[PDB]
Design brief:
The structure is a homodimer of 156-residue chains. Chain A is of the alpha/beta class. Chain A is 47% helix and 15% strand. The longest helix of chain A is centred in the N-terminal third of the chain and has 16 residues. Chain A is globular and about 45 Å long. Chain A starts with a strand and ends in a 7-residue tail after the last helix. Chains A and B meet through helix 2, helix 3, strand 4, helix 4 and helix 6 of A and helix 2, helix 3, strand 4, helix 4 and helix 6 of B. It is classed as isomerase. The entry lists the keywords isomerase, phosphopentose isomerase B, pentose phosphate pathway, RV2465C, phosphoriboisomerase B, structural proteomics in europe, spine, structural genomics.
Chain lengths: 156, 156
């Protein structure tokens, strides 16, 4: 059972609703960060920042941000200190996001998949373990040190 | 996007070299941020940070980071202040990245595509204009203000 913070603008709103329901039915704990209603003009960043911020502050939790393509949404989430947000467009990329990147969040594009395909991506994301392999942690640590100082690490 | 900065560790190295040659042939000026040779044990974050820093610092340029899935790479690029790196897994997402997100960079997952498919993603990325539409700029501006200040914008 995993706690999952969800965020979405209008383009991901309907898919967010379905994911919340799906996560409840599969034994997880969805927390809705908004949008709470459909508003065709609303702006994704605030919802994605909210989901990623809450995810980072609640270790062990995951997050999912939803939009049209998911790309604006993952970009926004990645601006949050300590957040790692992959774009999941397949079961394989969702699983690898966890296994290799230890991503706490994924973005999904609601306009890119059927509901069936989106829920399978979610399933892979919420069940795949972080591998803890040395090279993966080393790379996470390098990026984290860059995030701390914004001093670009030298290339070999 | 005529100057194009590219970065990849070993996992994206061969595809990066193929893309550099393709960009030369289509009239662009690819700039290799590294890796300059295949080294099985190198780490992507420095190359992706270098590519994103140099892209953001160079008006009118674009950047591409290549990996296995591309997800670690776009996460790294997105930690650079001012950078917007989408994950492009199709011609449609590469185009939308420019049109909606004004993404200066994309990540591509070389293991997820044939070379032909990958070069077509690249073509869409470097030819699709930024829309300059009000709502898209408004969303970029909100994110840029969050990067400046780390005050999460209020949720409606």
């Amino acid at each position: 059972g995993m706690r999952v913070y969800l965020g979405a603008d209008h383009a991901g709103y309907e898919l967010k609703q379905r994911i919340i329901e799906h996560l409840k039915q599969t034994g997880h704990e969805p927390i809705d960060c908004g949008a709470l209603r459909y508003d065709a003009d609303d702006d994704y960043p605030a919802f994605c920042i909210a989901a990623a911020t809450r995810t980072v502050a609640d270790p062990g939790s995951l997050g999912i941000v939803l939009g049209g393509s998911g790309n604006g949404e993952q970009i926004a989430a990645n601006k949050v200190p300590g957040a790692r947000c992959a774009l999941a467009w397949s079961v394989q990329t969702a699983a690898l996001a966890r296994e290799h990147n230890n991503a706490q969040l994924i973005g999904i594009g609601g306009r890119m998949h059927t509901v069936a395909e989106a829920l399978a991506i979610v399933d892979a994301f919420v069940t795949t373990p972080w591998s803890k392999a040395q090279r993966h942690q080393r790379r996470i640590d390098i990026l984290a040190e860059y995030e701390r100082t914004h001093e670009a690490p030298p290339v070999p």
